[model samples]
Target: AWVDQTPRTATKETGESLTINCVLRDASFELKDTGWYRTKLGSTNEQSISIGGRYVETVNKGSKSFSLRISDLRVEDSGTYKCQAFYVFFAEDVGSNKGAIIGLMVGGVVIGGEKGAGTALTVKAA
Candidate 1:
């Protein structure tokens, strides 16, 4: 078994850039061959978003580490991102796997006093 660590939660404003690093203990395996996914907890079942292979930024490809950078992040980017790695053994069977989750929040700030300063606006306007 392996362990992966990343930011459990993050707060960002609209149009902001976010870089998430995926760390692991094992480095002997092929890191670039790993898989990544994002699951959104909703009113129904969890929705899965694939962030595999070509979608990820391969940093330290041989060291079992990778990063996912969201440039100009939008409000729709707010959700939970799950990163996963698949290990193959005996040339045919999956030996092991690892994963981590990060909760992303995108919003702005409330102005004025207790009465409120109107509708909530994104960072770009506030």
Candidate 2:
């Protein structure tokens, strides 16, 4: 399972940039076919905002690695951003799993002036 450490939550004014980090542990291979998505608080529909390529592997690796940078934070960007990683399991089969979720609150004052005041998932491999 993977985990996110940096910028678990962010409250930024309009036009600011937000970067979220996704990390993993005890994995045999590098992550391939990574995607970033955003969905409303209580919605099942997720919008694909970014698709990463091989270069993403270089930027997002290691135990404390993997980062998604969102440029020009907008009010519409306020929501939950989920980092998903996909890799081949068997010979030709593929599987996907969620890494971490970064909550972005834009153009609003955080109640405690802190991000990620809510629930954050901690994943473990079984």
Candidate 3:
């Protein structure tokens, strides 16, 4: 229950960059590699990302915060980008059709989840 995201809005074209920040209230977890992912514009294939690749930057600020930047965007890059975290111990909000119930799991078990809302990105041609 310590996951949060900033800059949920984005609109850009090729050679542009989209930056978003992930902030956590609790820092007892770690981010998974290629934590930044985007739903392909017209496909189910999700593209995972990191710094210094197609992106202008990727920063691992600390246990409480992290960020990503995508540059030289392509037409296929327009889609929803989600920031997910993986950890063995973490707190989560309620998820059910019956009712809402917050749960906290700890131990050696691993889990992956998306924090807050996904970033809706729009990329166009130059």
Model 1's C-alpha root-mean-square deviation from the true structure amounts to: 15.8
Model 3 agreement with the true structure over 1-126: per-residue lDDT tens digits: 455776786889787777877765454445543266777767777777655677654446465466777767777778888775544432332221111222344553335454546788888778
Candidate 1 residue-wise lDDT, 1-126, digit = tens: 353546666767886766666655643445434444453434334344455532445566566666666666566556666555543333222333223222222342111101101111122321
Cα error, candidate 3, residue 32 (Å): 7.3
Number of backbone-clashing residue pairs for each candidate, in the order shown = 0, 1, 1
lDDT of 2 by residue, 1-126 (tens): 444445566677776666666665445545544556667555668676544431132254444355666665556556776665544333222232232323323543111111122222222222
Error of 3 at 66 (Å): 0.9
**In model 2, which runs have C-alpha deviations exceeding 4 angstroms?**
41-44, 51-64, 91-126
Candidate order by TM-score, decreasing, is 3, 1, 2
Cα deviation in Å at residue 54, candidate 2?
19
Give the TM-scores of the predictions, in the order they appear: 0.56, 0.55, 0.64
Query: Evaluated with lDDT, which candidate comes out highest?
Result: 3
Q: What do the candidate models score in CA lDDT, each in turn?
A: 0.45, 0.47, 0.60
- lDDT ranking from best to worst? 3, 2, 1
Better of 1 and 3 by TM-score: 3
User: Per-residue error at 117 for model 3, in Å?
Assistant: 1.5
